[PDB]
Design a binder for this molecule. Sequence first.
Ligand code: ADP
Ligand code: ADP
Lengths: 453, 455, 172, 91
Amino acid sequence: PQVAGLKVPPHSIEAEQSVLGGLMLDNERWDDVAERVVADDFYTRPHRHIFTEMARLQESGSPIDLITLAESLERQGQLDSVGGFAYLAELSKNTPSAANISAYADIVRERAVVREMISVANEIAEAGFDPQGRTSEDLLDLAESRVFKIAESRANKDEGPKNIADVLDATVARIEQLFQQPHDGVTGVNTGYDDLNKKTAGLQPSDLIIVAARPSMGKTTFAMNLVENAAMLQDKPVLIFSLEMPSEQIMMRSLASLSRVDQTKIRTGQLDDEDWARISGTMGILLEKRNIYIDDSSGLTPTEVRSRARRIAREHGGIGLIMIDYLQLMRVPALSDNRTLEIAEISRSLKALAKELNVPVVALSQLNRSLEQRADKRPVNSDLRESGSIEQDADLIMFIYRDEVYHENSDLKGIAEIIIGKQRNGPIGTVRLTFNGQWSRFDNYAGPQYDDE
Amino acid sequence: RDPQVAGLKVPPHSIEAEQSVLGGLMLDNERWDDVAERVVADDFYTRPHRHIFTEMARLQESGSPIDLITLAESLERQGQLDSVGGFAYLAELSKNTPSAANISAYADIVRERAVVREMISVANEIAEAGFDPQGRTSEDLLDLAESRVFKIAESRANKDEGPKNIADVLDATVARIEQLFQQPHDGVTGVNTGYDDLNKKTAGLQPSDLIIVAARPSMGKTTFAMNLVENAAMLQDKPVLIFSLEMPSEQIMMRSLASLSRVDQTKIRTGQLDDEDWARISGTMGILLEKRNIYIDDSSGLTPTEVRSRARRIAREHGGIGLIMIDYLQLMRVPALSDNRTLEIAEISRSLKALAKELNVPVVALSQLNRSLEQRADKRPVNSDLRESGSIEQDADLIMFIYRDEVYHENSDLKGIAEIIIGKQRNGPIGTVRLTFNGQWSRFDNYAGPQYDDE
Amino acid sequence: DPQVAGLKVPPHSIEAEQSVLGGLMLDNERWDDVAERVVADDFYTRPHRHIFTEMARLQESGSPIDLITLAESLERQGQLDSVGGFAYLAELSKNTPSAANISAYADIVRERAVVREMISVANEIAEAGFDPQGRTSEDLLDLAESRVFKIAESRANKDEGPKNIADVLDAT
Amino acid sequence: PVVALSQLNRSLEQRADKRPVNSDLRESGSIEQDADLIMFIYRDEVYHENSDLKGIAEIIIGKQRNGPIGTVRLTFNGQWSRFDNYAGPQY
Ligand SMILES: Nc1ncnc2c1ncn2[C@@H]1O[C@H](COP(=O)(O)OP(=O)(O)O)[C@@H](O)[C@H]1O
Ligand SMILES: Nc1ncnc2c1ncn2[C@@H]1O[C@H](COP(=O)(O)OP(=O)(O)O)[C@@H](O)[C@H]1O
């Protein structure tokens, strides 16, 4: 066994032989070593067979030694796969030492996260020069999503092995949402509403959520007022893409939201007398809490949504509730790629990248002209008739409808009802936020819902 | 010294292009399910190269993966490293192979440097017969050449012809009239579904078919295809895989734990608000780690060529068949065409039916229908409502269309009665397997709990 | 050499790498839109990169970019020598009469360098991963992280408007 | 002075006016941009029947190096295989 500098994949064999002898003898180090080493880690195929027997018995309230290793393995028939007790007894020579066991749970960890970084630098180089990526810019979009998902909790592999142990524990660890917020300020990024968050239960934290509204409905009014109630409230770098407005026009709206001043006041009868009190109030709390980022370029291919939203999730944790106003402006590189198949590559690259970053992606679209020939003018599912591929690949869908823009003497003035049509992990309903649009703010202390019976 | 390009007795040979086939194979194990497709043994030019791929074969069937290290100990015992090159040679092809780049391109070359190298050495021994006939009555020479030029044979695996007959199938035919072992009067041949209603139309899921679920979107499409894979992991003890392309891993289990255990989802939506049901939770948590059956992978950039490089690395390193479910296959994209869906479906029609016949696995894929159903006054799906698709109406073997009346109406007497219209059926009749939608717990119970049968 | 030597050559499209340099040298009013989609260090071979840098700001800096204005600016910079000589400048000007489809040869050298630089990223992630020096898994998962996003490529100050600079609050 | 002869592909018939434009020899590249006197050939009584240019072919110059372009017409007797004198009609 010569020790030299060669090109070998990194793994240790004695160290795998060191741990398994310890847990064969001891059933008390299992308090420790089950925390930091999981399955799928050991090199040779028999080695994790022993580890699953170490796991199936230890939940079963049965001990582990060289005796019971033979017992279930002939009830399960795997005994001649590992080699019978002819090889398990060679693991009965390893360690009387109950020390360096976590240090041997460390080297077999250390040689197995580098080893999960050779099948990423070959899942790239076998996409290149054998193109299952077929263009350059979407060959980088797969060159990122096998890299940013690594820089993670690091119990993460690339993709493909997930035994139901390694997801059940990370499910119950994500039902540790039990000591903080016993009220229904549910696990998602909040919207800041006690009318919405009983019906949505928050914006569920890995879901593509689609807003749509007509023109003359105030679409970016709601999408910034939801973000401004989710930027000063949940600590995460909220990115915003917007193409309906230019960059500065958004900030001219948000300062009219946070400081509750009129936006007619911001350009006519300017920042003069006592509006300085509120604007210099919200130019301090927004000043250093580095949350809202905004980018507003015009050619936004769905390659260059990911490759802008990767940096945002790199520098931070990143539960950046990405707001992309006006999805139809997103223009794919192929031009003869038409509107039946333009959005069907956008419907399947937001939902497929609202999932890595665990970001509830709010994107914004609009309903066609044939909406406005109905009587009950509500934006329903069958009026997203541009492509019909986003109507079926979203998670939460909120169809905005303000009544006094389409009617005059009716008493539902200023009552925007956010219709929740497609609700996946919950029930449907109907919200009524209060359209206080002279500053573009919504909540329902003046609550337009009946609220009595 | 040797003379110039006029020396061409080396017929073809590719030795520089060979060491970069073993090179990346010495430094990767994920790519043996590719180079074995298009390079078999006895293609290489040099005899030390053949014993390397010889003992790269047994270790891949034994499961032990290959580096420099696990090879040489597996060449220490077998009496090798003396005539294969030595332990320095394995380091000679580890230091001088910098390419962790591409093996799928040097593998095609050694194939097409060997066919030409063999068809030269065929024509040096058929045209040696006229060059020296020592007398074998030339009609009987003519079956030598049929044995020479057709000795180029590639029998690496199962079903072929020549060594094939119908009596060689009739032993396998009486092998699968060896039922009435587990079910003396009761049930199914293949993999179960676990219902009193579905097992008399499909008679279980057939062990090489491609059962297609289709449904109007979020009208109960993953309520079914997880309930069924719930019922088919306590009933098989095999690696019953899942490809959830739509949902994330944390969100799959937060319905199945409400379905295996039948806790209500409001106890898992918010914070858990009972300590009676925690045993109902922790019991079925223990049941689900009593049997390590259900697998999950939540990719979302799935070509239908990289499906095969997952679902063969589960059924090889573990048990056999399982039930390779793939959720919502439009989210699978093929980047080859980037065309109308009437061709991008056609690679998935021709690859899922090429994965349900290597591994003999009932691939439960899922699709949806086009929006023009929403104007047909008989909204129940038929085969003429997959107009977006193309070829999936033909390649499938069991097509289930899931209507649900209470999601498209509110006068529904079918309150919680999800119905299953069997659109295509290969090996049986068609009909309506009406179930009880109890997706409060993500459940589909059976309608013979309620009053009537499956009319 | 035999033709198995197509192994260390990322695609790089020399025919598409010469028709752009013949496109600007005959048409000065195409460097406005071609230099948008194509930047330097996408050109594969060393003469083509620095020639594209020799048009430094020479759109509006008072030089119509022909062979004459190039050759004078080459030698005051000092590179009329064997990084192109002057005969290859005729091979770049007169042998390339290329049409108004430079925007077709623009996307090639955009898309044959991205696929090229995703090989040395796919090498220098992996070749470090076989020789572990005095640095742990917290190094390599954060040196493979940054080295991939060095291939945005580089265009301009973007991706981050408001609070970051925080000045796009103050640009309002 | 090398007369060379060439043909066009059926992309031209996609256009309504079938006059042979300069950008129909671009489809191979080195003939459109190395030609010195392109002289396209049209003829209407083979592409139509009711045209009054019957037998009178119109050579369309598409490029000229050291002079003007235009539309030079020629008459042709449809029996002798001989193109002939001045540009048969008035203009
Ligand atoms: N002074 C104002 N009073 C009322 N509404 C205003 C005022 N200024 C701007 N708005 C609203 O801002 C909205 C712009 O937001 P957006 O959602 O993009 O529009 P739409 O609802 O047409 O999509 C417009 O609908 C307009 O009604
Ligand atoms: N509390 C509930 N009440 C009624 N239905 C529910 C409830 N919770 C979940 N569901 C149902 O679960 C289904 C899940 O939809 P699903 O078929 O998984 O969507 P997809 O087609 O995207 O996979 C929804 O159709 C919804 O009707």
